[PDB]
Amino acid sequence: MVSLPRMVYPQPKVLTPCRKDVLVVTPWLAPIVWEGTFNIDILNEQFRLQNTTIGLTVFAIKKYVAFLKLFLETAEKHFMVGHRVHYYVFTDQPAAVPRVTLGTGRQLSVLEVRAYKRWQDVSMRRMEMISDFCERRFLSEVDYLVCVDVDMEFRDHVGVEILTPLFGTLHPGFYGSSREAFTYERRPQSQAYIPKDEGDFYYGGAFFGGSVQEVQRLTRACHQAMMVDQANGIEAVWHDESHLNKYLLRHKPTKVLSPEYLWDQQLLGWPAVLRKLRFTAVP
Amino acid sequence: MVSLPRMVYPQPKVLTPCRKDVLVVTPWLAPIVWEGTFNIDILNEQFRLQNTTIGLTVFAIKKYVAFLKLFLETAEKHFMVGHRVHYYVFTDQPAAVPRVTLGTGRQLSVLEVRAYKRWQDVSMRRMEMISDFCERRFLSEVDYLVCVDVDMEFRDHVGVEILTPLFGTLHPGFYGSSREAFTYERRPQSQAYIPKDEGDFYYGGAFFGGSVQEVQRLTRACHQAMMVDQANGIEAVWHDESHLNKYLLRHKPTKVLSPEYLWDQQLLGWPAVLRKLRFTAVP
Structure with missing residues (x-):
């Protein structure tokens, strides 16, 4: 980029590890993003000089619209502050989207979701719609997409340190677990199947992203795999999360976010290995 | 990429650091490549599925042609084995290039260097010629370029773990040093000037590279900066290495190679922090 x-x-201290308690780079040389691994001033400079725009997608269906107010208010305090942001709120109730005041350089669009009589089409809807919109809007409007769940709040910084062509996030229930304990789809009849002796990490469906092109590829692949499973009368154990995990096994992410970025303090507390709790479940 | x-x-063990004795990721989230940070089987798969071709440039002038035989023979044993390689040997003595037997998928071209009466044009020649050839050949022929010194030998694996848009290598004389001890150019009159309170690392001019596009950018910038200095009657303390260091300060590399990749065992021994000595000075 420019200078x-x-x-x-x-x-930087070559002979001092930045963390002594956690893995900070995957075996395919993707950074694992933890507090202490990055200087945010350097990264902010790099991304601002590229006039980066980040899109954030969120789905809020039925009673989950109640979560939007806190989600958006806390995103204003902690998500990509100083950078250009475009929120895309996918909902079945446009009138229920709260009026949240945004900082300069930040915008919000409301997109109405295709109503479906089939639960099967609802299960596939997020991957289908994200894939479809990567064409309709995102390619023209943003440089990166971040795809998250709405029943969450930002409690601390989530910024440009996450940005990369393709990222997944360590699910907070499994970051310390052996791969045989990961809740991957284990039936060979499913496109999402992963055998017991395969797997790097268990990634959470609640937080993934990348460049628009990589997100379009991921979401199309997951959508097409889910359609195959539907035709074959099988639903993966954890739905689109199972397919996300199959995709990221075979297409390695270029960064992995630590569970700082996807946490549930009610279920898991605040372990010492988490210096920050950035994006967390709402009680 | 493809699956x-x-x-x-x-x-991978999330709660076990891959190294406890060294920094494995820069503060701008570039991997620092040390033994123990990568699974080469994964990386080889990724790069082979992309049918990657790596170009290696080396200059052998005057008596340095004597180093070519060992340089090329050891590159055959250790450099990008299994991948497509194109060696580009820049020399003032094409007839002195030894006939080294190459493995399948590997080729060598000999390029004659522009003779110069001015030492100034000789000092600038490597950056000028690499930049020029990034247009004449490299863009069409290779995906990455690796630019190294000839008075060296490969003793151990140097492979696709290094490949990335832009890399530099920690100079073996300074990896444990404070930045004020780095031998950057310190005169403000030079384009290569770096003040005492700036600097990440001291990178060696003997080993750098990246995508053809990034290497073209680096070498053009260094060439143009050296021409400014020549006009202003100043020669940077360490010649093109000083300019390389100024460039990589202001354009952060996307990987940094550890001194495993650039070593002198006669001067520095074999410290415990070096698990492998990969590319080393010839006694």
């Missing part, structure tokens, strides 16, 4: 200006910051 | 096949390998 960085002069900056004064502490010298 | 990886099923592979059986050890699960």
Whole structure:
């Protein structure tokens, strides 16, 4: 990219690990993003000089519209602050979207979801609609897409350190688990099947993203795999999350976010290995 | 990219650092490549499925042609084995290039260097010629370029783990040093100037590379900066290495290679922090 200006910051210490308690790079040389691994001033400079725009997608269906107010208010406080942001709120109730005041350079669009009589089409809807909109809007409007669940709140910084062609996030229930305990789809009849001796991580369906092109590829692949399963009369154990995990096994993400980025404090507390709780379940 | 096949390998351990003695990721989230950070089977699969071709440039002038035989023979044993390779040997003595037997998928071209009466044009020649050839040949012929010194030998694996848009390599004399001890150009009159309170690492001019596009950008910038200095009657303290360091300060590399990749055992021994000595000075 274009040149960085002069900056004064502490010298990296080649002979001091940035973390001694966690893995900070995958075996395919993707950073695993934890507090202490990044200097956000450097990263903010890099992404601002590229005039980066980040799209954030969220689905709020039926009673989940109640979560939008806190979700958006806290995103204003913590998500990509200083950068251009475009929120895309997919909902069955446009009139229920709260009026949240946004900072400068930040916009929100409301998109109405296709109503479906079939639960099967509802299960596939997020991957289908994200894939479809990667064509209708996102390619023209944003550089990266971040796809998250709405029943959540931002409690701390979530910023440009996550941005990369393709990322997944360590599910908070499994980051310390052996792969045989991961709740992957285990039936060979499903497109999402992963055998007991395969798997890097258990990624959460509640937080993934990347460049628009990589997100279009991921979501199309997952949608097409779910349609195959539907034809074959099988529903993966964890729905689109199972397919996300199959996709990221075979297409390795270029960053992995630590569970700082996807947490549930009620269920899991605040372990010492989490220096920050950034994006968390609402009680 | 296209999907990886099923592979059986050890699960990554989220709560076990891959190294406890060294920094494995820069503060701008670039991997620092050390033994123990990568699974080469995964990386080989990724790069082979992309049918990657790696170009290697080397300059052998005057008596340095004597180093070519060992350089090329050891590159055959250790450099990008299994991948497509194109060696580009830039020399003032084409007839002195040894006939080294190459493995399948590997080729060598000899390019004669522009003779210069001015030492100034010789100092600039590598950056100028690499930049020029990024247009004449490299863009059409290779996906990545690796630019190294000839007075060296491969002693161990140097492979696709290094490949990325832009990389530099930690100079073996300075990896444990404070930035004020780095031998950057310190005169503000030079384009290569770096103040005492700036700098991430001291990168070696003997090993850098990246995608053809990024290498063209780097080498053009360094060439143009050296021409400014020549006009202003200043020669940077460490010549093109000083300019390389200025460029990589302001354009952060997307990987950094550890001194495993650039070593001198006669001067520095074999410290415990080096698990492998991959590319080393010839006594």
